[PDB]
């Protein structure tokens, strides 16, 4: 029948899609049939997400093969996102931290607990995608008005929405994951990261709680299912938080069981904790009534009480409560007692893995056993131990009051989780607090041993104090490239945008109160220097394309020099190039040497864009406002261009551009000594003092500068020829 | 005392009087007045619609409770329906997540009630109702001002106060989720909220419902109260239990739930999980590639072997062979065929395992050898306390771990007794 | 009856509210009764907006009385808004430009045409208000954990939502205005600005005004909604009449004096000529230009216009243009040239002027007439002119194709509109493109002549090139204060936040590509130096208060030196203060925001005993030099005790300085550096008298003085 044919046709198409190389080494726990029966008969097309996902995946695979990587941050505004693509960053990260911090019209801002509605991050992403698509439309409109020569000159920015967005823990079970993924896809997002935390306890700070691996895998599988239904080859990033986690909310998964901690004649950690809290309450700290949450039996309170007295913990409580009375909030005092209690309980309980426990008995080889225990279920490890050494071990004893089991968190556990998830994820990510290449290497090597083609991702916390690492500035510069080499293809400063937004606001708000409208002038100057699009806001937001739309809608019936231009020096260099018969049209560039620096670089560029000469300098003012040009470096790279007064022309421009009274050269070379001395003879400088190898100080000859700058260019013509 | 210290002490005192008022008689808070005032800042806010509605609505329900009378209502599906029911003289409104799921929104496809909508969804729905009620009141009042005193006495005036109890599901996660959900309800003027003791990820309207421990439920209710206290709204907290129909719980850590845990008494049986996965793997190995569910887990060979042994003895591998042959002779979707086998397999496993509570288990030992005295002790006893009492004078073979589902959920004896146990634990909150 | 009493009680309360000094000189076109009728019986309370509006209004009145002002900008994020208040700016602006530029989940970003849904700016404002209220809660939580002495030391920021938000043109008529105002009030916004543009054509760049009666109705509608909600909201009336050339009606007598008309009435209508020109293009084969098909203009009109177009040589230009088009093979540029030339020709021949200027030309008392014409209806001016023996004048001739009348835009028209609006608005604002004190003065003086108590507001366009004004840097610094003096109490850089957001993103993105993770290190360093709250993000977003909430919810059952510290110098100054029998604090901040130039200050208990103004500079190999532009030991009795020598020792250690350069030294500087050479701090000292001192650091002697035993150091202090 036509009905049966249409179905079989789509099942076949879907099967080819499944079997394509895009999904090599990916396991789906469902069939093409199961996907097609969800799609109905009315066509839909999520083309933005579909095409972005394709291109973005191919690009990441290209960089993984070249041992290269994208280094990015989370933009805090659509402007930031459009800007980073202008500056040539290839992809964007979008995180839940920044989303929490921003809030919304109905959401108060706050810490990242994924307590916002699951629509929150998609809604944020939607703003970014609309900004990128609008930027593309505005750019394209302008490029159509341009000629072929202008199009070859004026650069075209890539505004494709290569975004990997935060899907938290999935905000519940599989219907929540599918809904979250659907909302991302609908607004054009091609990548999503899901972590193995328990939704209710999700955090970024100590007591992280993991879920079993089967739960995490189901989240990833659910996501893939939704992506398949929507015909979008979305990039699924599996994050593990197992590196720092100490708790798990279930012990049902065999892969987690090797990492479980167990205790014995000791009473349960829960019993002891609650009994200790009850003692604080009975001694008159009414604030600590947490024991009312539980219905713990008398026998349990008795046993725990016994242990608490023997170990001297009830002693510590009595002392603590007396310290409290003599002095108010008991936050600090209780903390001290708890830590001491925990230390005591761990110590007495003999808290270790079932591996470590059977290893102690053996006093099968020792190292041979470890290998078996590390890949063995609890039931399988007990069966093998009894067959050989069945020690006392209970993980139930060590449960928290909530009922969470304790586990051995660390990179080995992160590896175990990530390896389990690898067949269901396109990218693996181990959450790190500290930036450390060795930790990253341990992870990457372990993964690649079993999955050589598995792409990885690395997070760079903005709060990690980089100056405590002991790394050199050069090691910091190279850190992203080092990640790339180990197969971390996508590395991101999570809420970078939030940080720079804050600093910018502090600065401008302070500047406005300090210097009034001069604060705006200085910002405008900065924008003119780097030739920012923000120079012309009306154009930036797409005024030209909008004007065109108004014309179409109505059938066309609707109704001083601020800085010395670089062009001036370019004209002088034309005279110069003419006299010495160079075929080379010389261009002048004046930008900060590095982004945001007061230190500028003036560069002279040929037709090939090879740098023929440069000056690295910064203007500085004295207390009365006089300006000095501090020169730290200068070069005439062409040996054939030297001793023709090229640098004398550049200096004349700089002195005019910056209204300089003097020029200081720090750590001069010999060439510098010879140059400044002869520039004294041409009359550019009145006086020149030189401490060989340390500093040159050259006072500007204002009359001679004024003479050379006369628009007739007579004196300037003589200087160039003689 | 500084003005800063005074302002604080003043609000702590006001808050303490509020706590101690008869409104909260028999209510336990796991926090102090100080902890509430710390959250409020210095810039006044006032959720007056919710505050005043909550007051009047609570008093009214108390009046009806004392008179042994009640409100009978339904969930309106539109603001018009809500305004209409108040015209017809129904005193209060219900608003549920089922209808919200079924309606969808501009960004939410309609569907079953799995609480998979954003936690803003039901509050947003409630907001429409409250605006409709307040607007109706304004329209009525405007007309009544144009009327004479005689016409006013003739023409009846309807009560459009927003007496609403709205669905807060499971709380959509932990305590920050509950507080956010409650905040959103209060902000749009809703004075009542119901929270159920289901696991958020598996929430359903009934088959296979999964409960949470009572400590988790109590924390949800306490979290809600905390948020309501911060906002100075004496909101009505409804604790729902789904324990009457539920068969599963996601933890065995709470002493109040432990009496209802189901365990195997015949401990030579392999785990339900092992047997289920082994059965699925057989289908796969016999050429049904569709059924690859076993690839979700990393079950050991020893476990697959033991389970395999049991599956053959009980004739289940037999049923699989027959099923796969029926499949080949027809190779269409195997949904129906697999279902029959699994149903037959579940029955077999439940029957051979001897599934009962640790209560029922020790009761059998004593009925072979006081009996009714023990039941009373077992029904209020932790698992550790019940084992200690049984060993003292009949410690039979019993394992609840054997009976866990593949997800790792424990089986429990659902029914009205379990509903009672949960509800009694929740009552002070 | 109780029903009648309750009503009369609220009417009386509402009447007292109306009559309060808050609304002195404000006209309402409605009664207290009309307000109470709207309120129903179920109480509501918009307390955030109500209390903010009260405090914000009183504050602006203080500032007006003192001839001072608030100078602010539009924050582009909730972080920016919280930050501005930290830095001590008292109030916030929120504009539709930035809202348009940002877009939303359903709104593509774009130019400011007020084409977003009227919910857009309120939704944006809501984010800001929630950020401010949350900041207050987080601050207050921390201050409760502090002791009374810690509270007296740590400053408390004012996070009250003093916001004036953009309500555009009102997004339609009175039900639209009331809805827009309601949405602002509901999210806690206490101030709103409404402009006198036509909604459909709203712009920031051919502006079209509405009659004054329409604008006044918008303002009255707003007041009505605010009164219903019991919020004394601040209504800002904006006029765009300074730059506008068009108005969509000639019905209001106040606008009629500014109407432009043709004096040469043998010319055909501007509309006729424009359409006829377009039709010619079409008929000559440019199918693209079919704009004339929008209208049903008669043959007689096309003929008359055609006649004029031929005589003036415009049809000539069209023929040439179409030939240029064919030879090349889009006609956007070509048509534009012809149109501009056509417009020039039509304006020239039509003799476009006001009916005032027209009757003034005939009389050749002159200056007496101007005064009458400027305050006269069109009908009243004609009656007075005929009586005085009535030139040819038609404004209909000059209408655009849409049917908009031309008007004489400028400051006089802005004044006329603003004076009409003054009794209905709390603040008046004349939209300006250029920043010019004289233009502002002309406006302010004209307003204050009739309304001495009328508060004003002034916009500072971020796109206005400040360096083209010819103002000095010092004049730019003083411009806000000068506005304040003329009674402009609230002055704002509209989309400042949008601009700084962009610059910050460009810089960091460039820096990350240039310098990898060193880009983050440098940002972190900057934050540590100024002690920014962004240093500790978890605290900034309210982690402590949130942790407390988790504890409450669960009943407490839930489970290396980067820089040489300022403290080191403070300890040295304790030794120093001890020996000379005098508690000195050290401060090291940028001299101005974002500057590489730092100021080290020494502060007493009463707070500046000494300072050094300097900047570190590196040579090309990385060696650091301290460049000192100023230094002071302000107390004459504290001099020549080696206070400055201690500060230098710290700075040299803190910055790992190889040398110290002093630019434009004084005599005291010469004496100081020379003696510091003798103590061995410097090996070599070169001095060009009055220009520069260069002093090379003696590394051995520095190392000796920095030994933790403080033996050498103690000897240095005591002499
Ligand atoms: C603080 C610092 O900048 S230190 C870093 C300095 N950089 C270097 O040493 C890099 C290597 N050197 C160079 O690239 C170049 O030689 C530079 C940049 C120093 C000078 O560039 P040039 O284009 O040669 O300088 P320019 O020609 O303008 O010099 C002006 C006058 O000095 C003279 N001059 C320049 N170099 C020399 C030399 N080595 N010997 C004699 N005279 C010289 C020129 O001939 C000219 O005078 P004249 O035409 O009247 O004879
Ligand atoms: C930095 C610039 O480019 S602008 C110039 C700086 N500012 C000024 O001139 C403003 C006024 N001057 C001053 O405030 C002070 O004189 C300063 C800042 C220059 C010096 O401050 P002091 O705290 O006196 O410097 P300090 O005590 O460290 O001086 C170090 C040595 O120089 C000597 N010295 C400093 N000033 C004098 C002086 N006027 N006469 C003689 N000796 C002096 C000191 O006596 C000391 O040597 P000694 O104690 O062993 O005899
Ligand atoms: Mg993989
Ligand atoms: Mg109760
Ligand atoms: Mg007024």
Numbering used by the authors:
A (entry chain C): 12 to 216, 219 to 276, 279 to 342, 345 to 380, 391 to 415, 417 to 587, 602 to 764
B (entry chain B): 11 to 216, 219 to 342, 344 to 382, 392 to 415, 417 to 452
C (entry chain A): 12 to 216, 220 to 343, 346 to 380, 392 to 416, 418 to 587, 602 to 624, 627 to 651, 653 to 764
Q: What are the paper's exact sentences on this?
A:
Isocitrate lyase (ICL) isoforms 1 and 2 are key enzymes in this process, through their roles in the glyoxylate and methylcitrate cycles. Our results provide strong evidence that ICL2 may act as a gate-keeping enzyme, allosterically regulating the glyoxylate shunt and the methylcitrate cycle, an essential mechanism during chronic infection when Mtb uses lipids as the primary carbon source.
One molecule of acetyl-CoA binds to each of the C-terminal domains in the tetramer, inducing striking conformational changes. In the acetyl-CoA-bound structure, the C-terminal domain from one monomer moves an average of 77 Å towards the centre of ICL2 and rotates ~176° to form a new dimer with the C-terminal domain from the opposing monomer. However, due to the constraints from the length of the linker region, such large movements would be prohibited in the ligand-free conformation, making the repositioning of the C-terminal domains necessary in order to form the new dimers upon acetyl-CoA binding. However, in the presence of acetyl-CoA, ICL2 displayed a remarkable 50-fold increase in catalytic efficiency (kcat/KM 37,200 ± 6000 M−1 s−1 at 27 °C). The distribution of the RMSD values in acetyl-CoA-bound ICL2 suggests a shift in the active site loop conformation towards a more catalytically-relevant conformation akin to that in substrate-bound Bm ICL1. Two residues from the active site loop (residues 214 and 215) showed correlation with the C-terminal domain in acetyl-CoA-bound ICL2, indicating the repositioning of the C-terminal domains has an influence on the movement of the active site loop.
